[PDB]
């Protein structure tokens, strides 16, 4: 934000990437000056298949390919499956997990306790992609908040209905909860009866609407060239 004061809310920060654990090279079983390695499945590694490099989670895929078909591609022509030269069964390739990082905190006017959101990524790998308050959500993993079953109005939105609030917990901490949509009210329908109120009040509310914005105008040569004659 380029500011020394950060207010209350959810704020986007620099993202995170799951780096490859190893590097895997596959060559036919005459190859080049470099030599192949062993296969690693279901983990984030670098891959190489006869020159087709990259980083991906190689899988235990059961894809059926035609015998001449060495590679495959997605609908957007991105390479999704390869034929390993060592093992001619087909391995589907999915490059590793990542996501945007959002910081959920109350304002520095109030406090400096930090809860971190990892959007769309499961908590099974997030703190080693430090923890101590972990909540798993379909919208993404959450570090630094404790889940509370008590439903309230949404303080800071996270995603998939979960909202985070700053409350004393018995002490101040950040706690996540499923949002409350309001109270619950059953109106007993019965055709013998109506219900009409007796006393009425008068109340005043507020509505705010923008009408205009700042008028601006731009000189060509002064902006682009800055009073240079040969630039003009």
């Amino acid at each position: 934000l380029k500011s020394f004061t950060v207010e209350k809310g959810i704020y986007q920060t620099s993202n995170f990437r799951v780096q490859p654990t190893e590097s895997i090279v596959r060559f036919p079983n005459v190859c080049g000056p470099k030599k192949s390695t062993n296969l690693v499945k279901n983990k984030c590694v670098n891959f190489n298949f006869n020159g087709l490099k990259g980083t991906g989670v190689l899988t235990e895929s059961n894809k059926k390919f035609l015998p001449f078909q060495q590679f495959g591609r997605d609908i957007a022509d991105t390479t999704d499956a390869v034929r390993d030269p060592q093992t001619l069964e087909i391995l589907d390739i999915t490059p590793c997990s990542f996501g945007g990082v959002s910081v959920i905190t109350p304002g520095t006017n109030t406090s400096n306790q930090v809860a971190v959101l990892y959007q769309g990524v499961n908590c099974t790998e997030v703190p080693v992609a430090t923890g101590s308050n972990v909540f798993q959500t379909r919208a993404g993993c959450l570090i630094g908040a404790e889940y509370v079953n008590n439903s309230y109005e949404c303080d800071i939105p996270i995603g998939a209905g979960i909202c985070a609030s700053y409350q004393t917990q018995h002490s101040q901490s950040i706690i996540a909860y499923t949002m409350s949509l309001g109270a619950e009210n059953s109106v007993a329908y019965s055709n013998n009866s109506i219900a009409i109120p007796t006393n009425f009040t008068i109340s005043v509310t507020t509505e705010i609407l923008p009408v205009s914005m700042t008028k601006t105008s731009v000189d060509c040569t002064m902006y682009i060239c800055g009073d240079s004659t040969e630039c003009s």
């Binding site: 509505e207 923008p210 902006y223």
Partner: protein, 248 residues
């Protein structure tokens, strides 16, 4: 009389203002004092106009800071191009700088055009709310104020306008027995206004918004059918106000 007009549009007869006139005025003045306290306390209330100011300031401060961008050139200072180069690459660097600054200016103009379309939509909405609630009474639900609309007052603001919507909310509930019609000696009575209410022993008519019982007469009801046609009909002797006048 203006309050008698505004109540007349929301299902309230003219007399109901004057029967609570001091109380209505006191509640109105208390609500004005409450919104004085709310505007004095909440410094985050004016979010949209401060957001308009922040949008304009951010757009100008990010267009101005793009002058220092090289856009892949040797420098954004043109005298470095004009003093440390021959012209055959200097024209290439000029082309890069002019194309980058013109692209940034095009981006700023496109952002201003999109935001001007959004601000024009908001200003058309504000002019419609002006013409419908300052110049009239809004018959459209949840347009000016939640509930039955009474007034709205325009207040000037930096790059915008602020309305003070005065609403009408019923508060104290009660339940009564009802009938779609009441049949007296083969005449189904349809009320011209109001719904039949029964307190247990007697039958009354009452307006749908606040409690106002009146004895069911022939003046407030009209007949166009018999007992059989109305489903869920009950019996009561419809009293005739002509009957004391017949004995006069």
């Amino acid at each position: 009389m203006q309050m008698a007009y505004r109540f007349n549009g929301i299902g309230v007869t003219q007399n109901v203002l004057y029967e609570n006139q001091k109380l209505i005025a006191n509640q109105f003045n208390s609500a004005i004092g409450k919104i004085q306290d709310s505007l004095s306390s909440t410094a985050s209330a004016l979010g949209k106009l401060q957001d308009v100011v922040n949008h304009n300031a951010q757009a100008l401060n990010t267009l101005v800071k793009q002058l220092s961008s090289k856009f892949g050139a040797i420098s954004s200072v043109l005298n470095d191009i004009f003093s440390r180069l021959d012209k055959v690459e200097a024209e290439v660097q000029i082309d890069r700088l002019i194309t980058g600054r013109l692209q940034s200016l095009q981006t700023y103009v496109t952002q201003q055009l999109i935001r001007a379309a959004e601000i024009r939509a908001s200003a058309n909405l504000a002019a419609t709310k002006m013409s419908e609630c300052v110049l009239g009474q809004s018959k459209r639900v949840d347009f000016c104020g939640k509930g039955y609309h009474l007034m709205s007052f325009p207040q000037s603001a930096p790059h915008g306008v602020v309305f003070l919507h005065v609403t009408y909310v019923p508060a104290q509930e009660k339940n009564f027995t009802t009938a779609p019609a009441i049949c007296h000696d083969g005449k189904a009575h349809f009320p011209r206004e109001g719904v039949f209410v029964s307190n247990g022993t007697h039958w009354f008519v009452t307006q749908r918004n606040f409690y106002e019982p009146q004895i069911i007469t022939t003046d407030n009801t009209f007949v166009s059918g018999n007992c059989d046609v109305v489903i869920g009909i009950v019996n009561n002797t419809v009293y005739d106000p002509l009957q004391p006048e017949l004995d006069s």
